[PDB]
Amino acid sequence: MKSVITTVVSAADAAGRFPSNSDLESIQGNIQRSAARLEAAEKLAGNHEAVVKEAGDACFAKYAYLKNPGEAGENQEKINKCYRDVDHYMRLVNYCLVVGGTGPLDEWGIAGAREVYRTLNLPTSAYVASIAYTRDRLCVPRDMSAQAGVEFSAYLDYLINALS
Amino acid sequence: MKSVITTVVSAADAAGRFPSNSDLESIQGNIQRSAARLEAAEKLAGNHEAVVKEAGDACFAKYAYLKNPGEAGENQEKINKCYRDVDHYMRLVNYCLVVGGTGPLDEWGIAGAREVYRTLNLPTSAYVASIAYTRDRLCVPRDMSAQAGVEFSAYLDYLINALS
Amino acid sequence: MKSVITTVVSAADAAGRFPSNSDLESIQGNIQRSAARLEAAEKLAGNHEAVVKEAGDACFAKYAYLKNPGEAGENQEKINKCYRDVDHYMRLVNYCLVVGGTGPLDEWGIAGAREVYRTLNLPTSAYVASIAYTRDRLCVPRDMSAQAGVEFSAYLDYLINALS
Amino acid sequence: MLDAFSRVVVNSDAKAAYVGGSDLQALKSFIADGNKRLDAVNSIVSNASCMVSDAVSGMICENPGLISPGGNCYTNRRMAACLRDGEIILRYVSYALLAGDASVLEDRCLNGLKETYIALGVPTNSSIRAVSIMKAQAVAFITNTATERKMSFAAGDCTSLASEVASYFDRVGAAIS
Amino acid sequence: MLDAFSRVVVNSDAKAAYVGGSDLQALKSFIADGNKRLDAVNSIVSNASCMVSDAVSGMICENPGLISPGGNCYTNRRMAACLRDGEIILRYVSYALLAGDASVLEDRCLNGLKETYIALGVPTNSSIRAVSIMKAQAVAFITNTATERKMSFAAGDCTSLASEVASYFDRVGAAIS
Amino acid sequence: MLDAFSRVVVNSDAKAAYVGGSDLQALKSFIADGNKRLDAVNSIVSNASCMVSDAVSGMICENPGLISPGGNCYTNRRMAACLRDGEIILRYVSYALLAGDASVLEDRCLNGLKETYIALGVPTNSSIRAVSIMKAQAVAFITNTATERKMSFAAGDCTSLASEVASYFDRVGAAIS
Ligand SMILES: *C(=C)C1=C(C)[C@@H](Cc2[nH]c(/C=C3N=C(/C=C4\NC(=O)[C@H](C)[C@H]4[C@@H](*)C)C(C)=C\3CCC(=O)O)c(CCC(=O)O)c2C)NC1=O
Ligand SMILES: *C(=C)C1=C(C)[C@@H](Cc2[nH]c(/C=C3N=C(/C=C4\NC(=O)[C@H](C)[C@H]4[C@@H](*)C)C(C)=C\3CCC(=O)O)c(CCC(=O)O)c2C)NC1=O
Ligand SMILES: *C(=C)C1=C(C)[C@@H](Cc2[nH]c(/C=C3N=C(/C=C4\NC(=O)[C@H](C)[C@H]4[C@@H](*)C)C(C)=C\3CCC(=O)O)c(CCC(=O)O)c2C)NC1=O
Ligand SMILES: *[C@@H](C)[C@H]1/C(=C/C2=NC(=C\c3[nH]c(C[C@H]4NC(=O)C(C=C)=C4C)c(C)c3CCC(=O)O)/C(CCC(=O)O)=C2C)NC(=O)[C@@H]1C
Ligand SMILES: *[C@@H](C)[C@H]1/C(=C/C2=NC(=C\c3[nH]c(C[C@H]4NC(=O)C(C=C)=C4C)c(C)c3CCC(=O)O)/C(CCC(=O)O)=C2C)NC(=O)[C@@H]1C
Ligand SMILES: *[C@@H](C)[C@H]1/C(=C/C2=NC(=C\c3[nH]c(C[C@H]4NC(=O)C(C=C)=C4C)c(C)c3CCC(=O)O)/C(CCC(=O)O)=C2C)NC(=O)[C@@H]1C
Ligand SMILES: *[C@H](C)[C@H]1/C(=C/C2=NC(=C\c3[nH]c(C[C@H]4NC(=O)C(C=C)=C4C)c(C)c3CCC(=O)O)/C(CCC(=O)O)=C2C)NC(=O)[C@@H]1C
Ligand SMILES: *[C@H](C)[C@H]1/C(=C/C2=NC(=C\c3[nH]c(C[C@H]4NC(=O)C(C=C)=C4C)c(C)c3CCC(=O)O)/C(CCC(=O)O)=C2C)NC(=O)[C@@H]1C
Ligand SMILES: *[C@H](C)[C@H]1/C(=C/C2=NC(=C\c3[nH]c(C[C@H]4NC(=O)C(C=C)=C4C)c(C)c3CCC(=O)O)/C(CCC(=O)O)=C2C)NC(=O)[C@@H]1C
Ligand SMILES: *[C@H](C)[C@H]1/C(=C/C2=NC(=C\c3[nH]c(C[C@H]4NC(=O)C(C=C)=C4C)c(C)c3CCC(=O)O)/C(CCC(=O)O)=C2C)NC(=O)[C@@H]1C
Ligand SMILES: *[C@H](C)[C@H]1/C(=C/C2=NC(=C\c3[nH]c(C[C@H]4NC(=O)C(C=C)=C4C)c(C)c3CCC(=O)O)/C(CCC(=O)O)=C2C)NC(=O)[C@@H]1C
Ligand SMILES: *[C@H](C)[C@H]1/C(=C/C2=NC(=C\c3[nH]c(C[C@H]4NC(=O)C(C=C)=C4C)c(C)c3CCC(=O)O)/C(CCC(=O)O)=C2C)NC(=O)[C@@H]1C
Ligand SMILES: *[C@H](C)[C@H]1/C(=C/C2=NC(=C\c3[nH]c(C[C@H]4NC(=O)C(C=C)=C4C)c(C)c3CCC(=O)O)/C(CCC(=O)O)=C2C)NC(=O)[C@@H]1C
Ligand SMILES: *[C@H](C)[C@H]1/C(=C/C2=NC(=C\c3[nH]c(C[C@H]4NC(=O)C(C=C)=C4C)c(C)c3CCC(=O)O)/C(CCC(=O)O)=C2C)NC(=O)[C@@H]1C
């Protein structure tokens, strides 16, 4: 699960080394930055249903064709799977804010996504519309502090770029 | 077992591919050519004892020294193993005509032959004399059609070249 | 265990070869040289306690600091382990004289020695002082014949160079 | 690997026998019906993406716990692996149909697979249901009786080819149970 | 590998749950006490050579048959291997302490080790005693109560870190018994 | 691998003992009789092709089912493998005789071989008969009592060398039964 800790430990292990100063110094960065990301994670945890509804709504408002026969949102059960998928990504963003790295997105959300969405004929731009809507809907300092926004937005761009 | 089918399937598998048009088109060649080779195979199946007797006789007529003390045909049991070996090759030629490829010769007759014949001091030219005699004894259209002869002769040259 | 025999056998095996003349001829060298080395081995076997006492004594006479608090010979049990280690090397030299190669030193005395002596803070020069003392104490023909001395001395230099 | 022809050769060789007229009528029919075999393989490969997608989605909509956390299809990585396995299996069944022999499927796909699925925790029962659905799809395509798509053929009986491909799909379940 | 944070994430993910305030107080403390954790890891790595040396020598002086012929520490090659294993184990325990999670130790060091020691004839009981001695040393260093050396720290309570590293050392014996 | 000399060294080392006069008389004889050992190895390697050929042919003429279809010597590929195995075994027995120790044979040839033959279906009983024939041939050559060929030696007693090579051949059967 990529994070500050796991990156430095993996690198030391690959070299047969004990932890040393740059490893400990890297981890001091955790101690400084954790407040901003854990603020974003808590805001997310506390309000994900409303966030996910707005994001899924924006997807379908942008792409009404999705609701046509044979398209990815042709019926209610498929529509609900779409909002569920937005909820999964938001939960993984919460996980990345907690871990302080992209590990939970990389492992549980991005790896194999291309193959899945292509095979199941789910258009990537619809996912990107959801995540981008959320990134641009973010309101600082209304919703959270500036640095909590930066952390939150970084993971949303990371996912967008991963899908693009 | 090398054939038209196994060559194209192996190649598609090596590439992770479904069968595609050139694979199916290759196999259409089976459907066109099978009549000529199955004619040769049936003629062989029906008359192998006479063929093998003529071929083994020609070997020993060409190489009377084989019957001297310490040579490969020094007694009757060794002589009979020689005609048996000619019969084995002829049976494998029948198999190649049926399969439409060299697989049965390659796998069951050629692979390891050099080592065996050298170790057991069996002269290769005696085998070649048998097979070449059969190739040149072939009589078209007396024995089979021109294209059945071509198929039959191709496998006999293939074996000769394999031993040379 | 490196020796004349094992070197030539290993080389033939690596090539898939039966023993051949240079292999047998190498082993004739055993038959010529064994007398000199087995003389040295027997002299060693018969007088190792006296040899080892002189060698360990010379180590500590050269390096009195070893007996200071926190050094490698700070107490009697550690001192006795030092003479024991000299005895082990001498026993391995006896083994090399018997085998006609460095195998027993390489395998049981040299391999991993650097790591062990560095980790346990045992100074290599103290070992070298013991072994060199023995090499220079050797007295020909008082102690053994000239060629037995050459064999004995070769293994002592081999170990010195291995530690240097 | 063997094909229909080399299969007969293997059986004959076991008895040191030449292959002659009596044994050759079956292979003569194999050849006479060869265009049908090519068409049957074409009807599968031409719909292979939709087959795999629909079969694995069908496995899941019947057993939606597969996509709960801890389900074996949960996460994109697992869903992608499963879809990949679905296509691999179809690809090897399609080789078996083109060759008229199961050996490529058994040797290169099925051997080792039960142990592997056991080791990974891939549920062999759901795997069998995905495979049964592809069986249903394959038979439909080969007999041009698929509900959502028709293809183009000279009219004739392909019952035997449909039966034969079903036997290859049935091999996968047998190997993994 | 996981760390303290990704551990919580794994547990939450099993329930499809977001990590929110209630679960976050523990990780907030983990962070608030983070300098202590860095100091504890520093006190071990800074004395790692002496630890391994003293622990393996201690194993031997308690069981001197280990260096008799046929003993598993006999010859330099065997002694060097054992010392190497001592340091490897310490290195992975030190990763576990820096990460606040045992998974790097379990996954990369402990898995396969019992079978390996069984196969080689490395005595798992003596191995456990070397590990117990390093445990004793590690706790001493982390609490600045080592008899022969002190290091420099702002005064405070590191009982929990000492307990935690002891639990990692105790994992090694558990895996190899 | 060990040879006769390093064998004694291994045994002495187990007791932390120097090798001295008492133990050295056997190795002194080994050396004094060393030219005989070289001659014995020469008489085998110089006839090795004929030995293998005759032994494997002898196995077959006694058990002609081996070359029926389904026999383990049937096809050139199988016959070539068997002949290859015959020569490998002889080559390792010839190393053991040159070294005066079985360890090269046991370690590099015999270890793993029963399992392998079991896995491949190579008949271990026929394998033993081929090996027994090479034993008979080897003893004949070393004692210059082969019926079809004599070699050149200064006259003397090589009973012990013949006994010793027979013990190495007898090791192969023991390992594969
Ligand atoms: C979940 C709600 C769910 C499904 C998803 C679905 C799975 C399913 N599918 C079949 C049968 C077929 N699927 C076919 C696939 C295709 N036909 C096409 O035209 C396109 C190219 C392609 C992909 C869409 C085909 C050909 C069949 C065969 C029957 C038919 O033609 O109608 C089944 C039935 C399985 C069986 O018989 O055992 C299932 C379960 N069903 C779901 O409930
Ligand atoms: C054999 C005669 C024998 C030993 C060798 C020794 C092994 C041993 N060591 C301990 C405890 C510790 N060793 C420590 C190591 C060090 N302290 C230092 O200052 C340097 C840097 C470093 C290496 C010398 C430490 C810190 C301890 C903890 C206790 C302490 O500080 O005094 C034990 C006790 C093990 C236990 O409690 O189970 C043993 C057995 N003892 C021998 O008998
Ligand atoms: C099948 C009809 C059949 C055989 C083939 C044969 C196998 C066999 N061979 C022996 C004994 C020996 N073979 C030897 C080989 C050679 N001697 C040579 O001069 C050349 C160089 C070389 C290869 C031809 C030798 C030396 C012997 C030892 C006896 C002897 O010298 O006469 C046996 C006897 C095996 C036994 O004693 O258990 C067998 C079965 N016999 C066949 O029936
Ligand atoms: C069951 C599978 C089908 C069905 C198949 C039939 N195909 C028949 C004839 C035929 N098909 C092809 C195409 C095939 N041959 C190729 O070479 C290639 C690609 C390389 C393919 C895909 C050909 C050439 C022919 C021969 C006739 C022609 O020239 O068009 C056929 C008629 C009987 C026969 O020839 O055996 C049948 C029954 N028919 C069906 O109705 C189901 C759906
Ligand atoms: C138990 C392990 C110890 C102990 C540890 C404490 N350390 C405390 C403060 C502290 N320590 C460091 C060093 C650490 N931070 C780093 O960034 C690096 C290297 C990159 C290291 C090794 C720092 C920076 C601080 C913060 C205070 C300062 O600026 O100096 C501490 C005080 C409480 C706290 O800050 O949490 C304790 C208790 N103390 C002990 O007595 C035992 C022996
Ligand atoms: C049983 C194996 C034999 C037998 C062997 C004897 N060989 C004797 C002497 C001898 N043989 C060699 C050849 C050997 N030494 C080599 O260096 C090499 C190749 C590098 C080979 C093949 C030598 C040099 C000698 C020494 C005498 C000489 O100079 O010719 C021998 C005599 C007793 C002895 O020296 O130990 C025997 C008995 N003799 C037999 O009759 C059976 C068949
Ligand atoms: C929303 C922007 C889309 C949309 C989405 C649909 N997704 C469908 C299925 C589905 N989604 C995923 C990814 C999701 N599952 C996970 O486990 C994780 C991470 C933990 C994520 C992000 C998977 C793997 C699947 C397949 C398995 C399943 O069915 O749940 C889906 C059903 C597709 C179908 O049945 O054909 C839809 C409709 N729908 C939309 O309109 C836009 C494009
Ligand atoms: C920002 C520069 C604007 C501004 C934006 C408004 N946002 C409004 C409501 C709102 N926003 C969100 C998503 C947001 N809440 C979260 O908890 C997180 C992430 C953790 C995000 C991105 C939601 C769910 C809602 C509706 C619930 C609520 O009111 O909080 C809003 C209200 C009216 C509207 O719906 O458009 C506005 C106007 N407001 C500003 O003053 C600056 C200029
Ligand atoms: C005929 C042109 C030769 C001749 C041949 C002899 N062959 C002898 C043995 C033999 N032949 C083969 C190859 C054969 N066996 C197979 O399984 C297959 C393919 C399926 C083939 C083509 C093998 C492997 C062997 C060895 C095993 C056996 O004995 O059957 C043979 C006996 C040799 C001996 O005992 O020394 C002879 C004499 N003899 C001739 O005069 C010409 C050269
Ligand atoms: C051909 C250009 C000549 C010709 C040749 C003759 N062949 C004679 C008999 C014959 N040929 C074979 C081998 C042949 N029969 C087979 O079944 C196969 C392969 C499947 C082959 C290669 C045999 C076994 C026999 C004897 C049995 C029989 O008569 O069929 C032949 C008879 C006299 C003789 O033995 O020399 C001749 C003259 N005949 C021609 O008219 C053209 C010029
Ligand atoms: C040599 C060029 C000198 C010489 C040297 C002396 N050596 C004396 C005694 C002695 N040497 C050894 C070690 C030696 N004995 C062995 O068995 C082996 C290896 C197998 C070695 C290297 C020992 C253990 C001893 C003491 C027991 C004994 O006397 O043999 C010696 C006696 C007086 C002294 O201790 O210094 C001398 C003078 N003697 C010479 O005449 C030439 C010039
Ligand atoms: C889909 C219908 C299943 C399902 C499938 C999963 N398979 C997973 C991994 C996997 N599968 C194989 C065998 C496959 N690879 C081959 O090369 C061949 C044939 C040549 C086949 C049939 C392997 C070796 C592996 C491991 C390597 C890899 O991951 O690709 C898998 C991932 C397991 C995991 O998460 O650890 C899944 C989910 N799972 C299902 O629930 C339905 C029933
Ligand atoms: C020391 C406290 C023991 C002891 C240790 C020995 N270990 C020996 C070999 C060995 N150890 C391992 C596992 C180690 N390597 C790894 O990479 C990792 C983790 C990633 C670990 C924990 C392996 C794989 C091996 C074999 C390869 C090698 O030799 O390095 C060993 C040599 C055994 C022998 O002589 O055959 C020893 C002596 N022995 C003891 O008596 C104390 C209890
Ligand atoms: C001959 C007297 C036997 C017999 C032998 C067969 N052995 C076959 C294959 C084989 N043998 C080995 C072991 C061999 N290779 C080594 O590298 C070493 C020592 C270092 C030895 C002793 C291996 C690994 C293999 C498999 C790889 C290969 O084929 O070379 C074999 C082929 C078996 C098959 O057809 O599948 C045969 C026939 N068979 C007999 O009936 C007599 C008793």
Give the whole-angstrom CA distance, residue A41 versus residue E57. Answer: 50
CB D37 within 8 A of CB D98: yes
User: Around F40, how many Cα atoms within 13 Å sit in the side-chain half-sphere?
Assistant: 29
Handedness of CA A19, A22, A26, A32 (dihedral sign): positive
Give the whole-angstrom CA distance, residue C89 versus residue C82. Answer: 11
Give the whole-angstrom CA distance, residue F33 versus residue C31. Answer: 9
| Secondary structure letter of residue A107 according to DSSP | I
Residue carrying structure tokens 């998928």? A85
**In this structure, what token pair is assigned to residue C90?**
């001498």
Of A13, A27, A95, Cβ closest to residue E38 = A27
Determine the residue type at A134. Answer: T
Tally of CB atoms within 10 A around C152: 26
Tally of CB atoms within 10 A around D90: 26
B79 CA to centre of own chain: 20
> Which helix or strand (DSSP H or E) is residue F136 part of?
helix F124-142
Of F9, F27, F44, Cβ closest to residue C104 = F9
Give the whole-angstrom CA distance, residue F8 versus residue F22. Answer: 12
User: Which atom of ligand 1 is nearest the CA belonging to D50?
Assistant: 23
Name the packing angle between helices E124-142 and E113-120 (round to 10°). 130
Name the packing angle between helices D21-32 and B21-62 (round to 10°). 160
Give how far Cα B45 sits from Cα of B53, B58, B101, B110, Å. Answer: 14, 21, 17, 21
CA dihedral A84→A90→A91→A95, nearest 10 degrees, is 160
Three-state helix/strand/coil letters over chain B = CCCHHHHHHHHHHHCCCCCCHHHHHHHHHHHHHHHHHHHHHHHHHHHHHHHHHHHHHHHHHHCHHHHCCCCCCCCHHHHHHHHHHHHHHHHHHHHHHHHCCCHHHHHHHHCCHHHHHHHCCCCHHHHHHHHHHHHHHCCCCCCCCHHHHHHHHHHHHHHHHHHC
Ligand index nearest the alpha carbon of residue A136:
8
> Which helix or strand (DSSP H or E) is residue A9 part of?
helix A4-14
**In this structure, what token pair is assigned to residue A94?**
């919460």
Nearest CA in chain F to D11: F69
CATH of the domain at F132: 1.10.490.20
Give how far Cα D122 sits from Cα of A106, C157, D53, D73, D117, Å. Answer: 22, 63, 18, 9, 5
B2 CA to centre of own chain: 14
- Integer-rounded Cα Rg, in Å, for chain F is 18
Please provide residue D90's backbone torsions phi and psi, each rounded to the nearest 5 degrees. Answer: -55, -40
Q: Nearest C-alpha of chain C: how many angstroms from E44?
A: 17
Contact: C115, E52; criterion CB under 8 Å: no
Give the whole-angstrom CA distance, residue D158 versus residue D140. Answer: 11
Q: Nearest C-alpha of chain E: how many angstroms from A66?
A: 27
E134 CA to centre of own chain: 8
User: Which atom of ligand 4 is nearest the CA belonging to D33?
Assistant: 36
CATH of the domain at B35: 1.10.490.20
- Quickly list DSSP for A17-63: ----HHHHHHHHHHHHHHHHHHHHHHHHHHHHHHHHHHHHHHHHHH-
Q: Is D40 in the pocket of ligand 4 (CB under 6 A)?
A: yes
Give how far Cα F25 sits from Cα of C151, F29, F72, F100, F169, Å. Answer: 20, 6, 48, 15, 27
State which residues form the domain around A134.
Answer: 1-164
Residue carrying structure tokens 């060789």? D13
Q: Is D158 in the pocket of ligand 4 (CB under 6 A)?
A: yes
Residue carrying structure tokens 């040379």? B164
D113 CA to centre of own chain: 15
Q: What angle do CA F57, F63, F67 make, to 5 degrees?
A: 70
Nearest CA among E173, E37, E48 for reference residue E105: E173
CB A141 within 8 A of CB A127: no
Q: Is D142 in the pocket of ligand 4 (CB under 6 A)?
A: yes
* Closest protein CA for atom 1 of ligand 4: D158
A19 Cβ neighbours under 8 A, 6+ residues apart: A8, A9, A12, E41, E45, E94, E95, E98
Nearest CA among A138, A153, A152 for reference residue A39: A152
**In this structure, what token pair is assigned to residue B92?**
């494998």
CB B6 within 8 A of CB B102: no
The distance between the two most distant Cα atoms of chain B, rounded to a whole number of Å, is: 60
CB E143 within 8 A of CB E159: yes
Residue carrying structure tokens 């639990």? E167
- Quickly list DSSP for F34-99: HHHHHHHHHHHHTTHHHHHHHHHHHHHHHSGGGGSTTSTT-SHHHHHHHHHHHHHHHHHHHHHHHH
Give the whole-angstrom CA distance, residue F55 versus residue E92. Answer: 57
Q: Is F85 in the pocket of ligand 14 (CB under 6 A)?
A: yes
Contact: D68, E16; criterion CB under 8 Å: yes
Q: Is the peptide bond before D64 cis (omega within 30 degrees of 0)?
A: no
Q: Which residues of E are annotated as a binding site for (2R,3E)-phycocyanobilin?
A: 35, 39, 72, 77, 82-88, 158
State which residues form the domain around F12.
Answer: 1-177
Give the whole-angstrom CA distance, residue D82 versus residue A112. Answer: 10
Q: Residues C57-90, buried b or exposed e (16+ Cβ, 10 A)?
A: ebbbebbeebeeeebbbeeeeebeebbebbbbbb
User: For testing the chain F interface, which of C10, C22, C27 should be mutated: the one with the most F CBs within 10 Å?
Assistant: C27
User: For testing the chain D interface, which of A119, A120, A159, A163 should be mutated: the one with the most D CBs within 10 Å?
Assistant: A119
Nearest CA among D81, D161, D85, D175 for reference residue D130: D85
User: Which atom of ligand 2 is nearest the CA belonging to E57?
Assistant: 5
CB C56 within 8 A of CB C48: no
Contact: A9, E5; criterion CB under 8 Å: no
Nearest CA in chain F to D17: F69
> C102: exposed, middle or buried (C-beta count within 10 Å: 0-12, 13-18, 19+)?
buried
User: For testing the chain C interface, which of E50, E56, E76 should be mutated: the one with the most C CBs within 10 Å?
Assistant: E76
Q: Is E52 in the pocket of ligand 13 (CB under 6 A)?
A: no
Among left, alpha and beta (phi > 0; psi -120 to 50; other), residue F157 is beta
Three-state helix/strand/coil letters over chain E = CCCHHHHHHHHHHHCCCCCCHHHHHHHHHHHHCHHHHHHHHHHHHCCHHHHHHHHHHHHHHHCHHHHCCCCCCCCHHHHHHHHHHHHHHHHHHHHHHHHCCCHHHHHHHHCCHHHHHHHHCCCHHHHHHHHHHHHHHHHHHHCCCCCCCCCCCCCCCCHHHHHHHHHHHHHHHHHHC
CB C108 within 8 A of CB C92: yes
Give the whole-angstrom CA distance, residue B9 versus residue B32. Answer: 19
* Closest protein CA for atom 19 of ligand 8: A44
Tally of CB atoms within 10 A around F132: 18
**In this structure, what token pair is assigned to residue F55?**
């032994």
Please provide residue D150's backbone torsions phi and psi, each rounded to the nearest 5 degrees. Answer: -115, 150
Give the whole-angstrom CA distance, residue B67 versus residue B78. Answer: 10
Q: Which technique was used to obtain these atomic coordinates?
A: X-ray
Residue carrying structure tokens 């050094």? C71
Contact: B1, D2; criterion CB under 8 Å: yes
Ligand index nearest the alpha carbon of residue D147:
1
**Number of structural domains, chain A?**
1
Name the packing angle between helices B4-14 and B21-62 (round to 10°). 130
Of F52, F75, F81, Cβ closest to residue B108 = F75
Ligand index nearest the alpha carbon of residue F62:
3
Contact: C42, F5; criterion CB under 8 Å: no
Give the whole-angstrom CA distance, residue B53 versus residue B49. Answer: 6
**Number of structural domains, chain F?**
1
Spacing, Cα C73 to ligand 14 middle (Å): 59
Contact residues on chain B for F75, CB-CB shorter than 8 A: 107-109, 111-112
Q: Nearest C-alpha of chain D: how many angstroms from E111?
A: 16
B84 CA to centre of own chain: 14
Handedness of CA B84, B87, B88, B89 (dihedral sign): positive
> A78: exposed, middle or buried (C-beta count within 10 Å: 0-12, 13-18, 19+)?
middle
Give the whole-angstrom CA distance, residue A93 versus residue A88. Answer: 9
**In this structure, what token pair is assigned to residue A119?**
């095979």
A9 Cβ neighbours under 8 A, 6+ residues apart: A19, A23, E1, E3, E95, E98, E99, E104
3-state secondary structure of D156: coil
C69 touches chain F (CB under 8 A): no
> E158: exposed, middle or buried (C-beta count within 10 Å: 0-12, 13-18, 19+)?
buried
Query: Ligand 10: which of B53, B140, B142 to mutate, judged by most atoms within 8 Å of the beta carbon?
Result: B142
Spacing, Cα F61 to ligand 14 middle (Å): 19
Give the whole-angstrom CA distance, residue A17 versus residue A3. Answer: 19
> F125: exposed, middle or buried (C-beta count within 10 Å: 0-12, 13-18, 19+)?
exposed
CB B105 within 8 A of CB B155: yes
Please provide residue F15's backbone torsions phi and psi, each rounded to the nearest 5 degrees. Answer: -100, 15
**In this structure, what token pair is assigned to residue E54?**
């003293």
Nearest CA among E24, E23, D70, E4 for reference residue A1: E4
Give the whole-angstrom CA distance, residue E162 versus residue F127. Answer: 63
Q: Is D80 in the pocket of ligand 12 (CB under 6 A)?
A: no
CB B154 within 8 A of CB B95: no
Give the whole-angstrom CA distance, residue E141 versus residue E55. Answer: 14
A111 touches chain D (CB under 8 A): yes
CB F73 within 8 A of CB F79: yes
Nearest CA in chain F to E75: F13
Tally of CB atoms within 10 A around D22: 8
Nearest CA among A151, A8, A28, A19 for reference residue E31: A28
Give how far Cα C21 sits from Cα of C12, C18, D94, F37, Å. Answer: 11, 10, 60, 13
> Which helix or strand (DSSP H or E) is residue A146 part of?
helix A146-163
C–A contact: 3+ Cβ pairs < 8 A: no
Give the whole-angstrom CA distance, residue C108 versus residue E82. Answer: 15
**In this structure, what token pair is assigned to residue B144?**
């089979």
Determine the residue type at F60. Answer: I
Give the whole-angstrom CA distance, residue E164 versus residue F117. Answer: 52
Nearest CA among B80, B81, B87, B15 for reference residue B50: B87
Nearest CA among B45, E4, B92, D15 for reference residue A5: E4
Ligand index nearest the alpha carbon of residue C31:
6
Please provide residue C26's backbone torsions phi and psi, each rounded to the nearest 5 degrees. Answer: -55, -45
Q: Is F123 in the pocket of ligand 14 (CB under 6 A)?
A: yes
CB F67 within 8 A of CB F80: no
Please provide residue C47's backbone torsions phi and psi, each rounded to the nearest 5 degrees. Answer: -140, 20
Ligand 8 shell residues, CB under 6 Å: A 43-44, 47, 50-51, 54, 134, 137-139, 142-143
Give the whole-angstrom CA distance, residue E8 versus residue E18. Answer: 10
User: Which atom of ligand 1 is nearest the CA belonging to D57?
Assistant: 5
A39 CA to centre of own chain: 15
CB B27 within 8 A of CB B19: no
Tally of CB atoms within 10 A around B8: 21
Q: Which residues of C are annotated as a binding site for (2R,3E)-phycocyanobilin?
A: 82
CB B64 within 8 A of CB B37: no
Give the whole-angstrom CA distance, residue E123 versus residue E118. Answer: 8
User: Around B85, how many Cα atoms within 13 Å sit in the side-chain half-sphere?
Assistant: 27
Give the whole-angstrom CA distance, residue F131 versus residue E84. Answer: 45
Nearest CA among F109, B38, B8 for reference residue D31: B38
Q: Is F136 in the pocket of ligand 3 (CB under 6 A)?
A: yes
Q: Could you tell me the end-to-end alpha-carbon distance of chain F, in angstroms, rounded to an integer?
A: 24
Give the whole-angstrom CA distance, residue F130 versus residue F135. Answer: 9
Give the whole-angstrom CA distance, residue E50 versus residue E64. Answer: 20
Nearest CA among C113, C92, C89 for reference residue C164: C113
Contact: C19, F45; criterion CB under 8 Å: yes
**In this structure, what token pair is assigned to residue E43?**
């006190």
Instruction: Tell me the helix, strand and coil percentages in chain F, rounded to 5.
Output: 75, 0, 25
Residue carrying structure tokens 């072994």? C131
CB D108 within 8 A of CB B13: yes
Q: Is E137 in the pocket of ligand 13 (CB under 6 A)?
A: no
Q: Is F77 assigned to a binding site?
A: yes
> E112: exposed, middle or buried (C-beta count within 10 Å: 0-12, 13-18, 19+)?
exposed
Spacing, Cα B50 to ligand 10 middle (Å): 10
E65 CA to centre of own chain: 26
Determine the residue type at E167. Answer: S
Q: Is C61 in the pocket of ligand 6 (CB under 6 A)?
A: no
* Closest protein CA for atom 1 of ligand 7: A82
> E141: exposed, middle or buried (C-beta count within 10 Å: 0-12, 13-18, 19+)?
buried
Contact: B108, F84; criterion CB under 8 Å: no
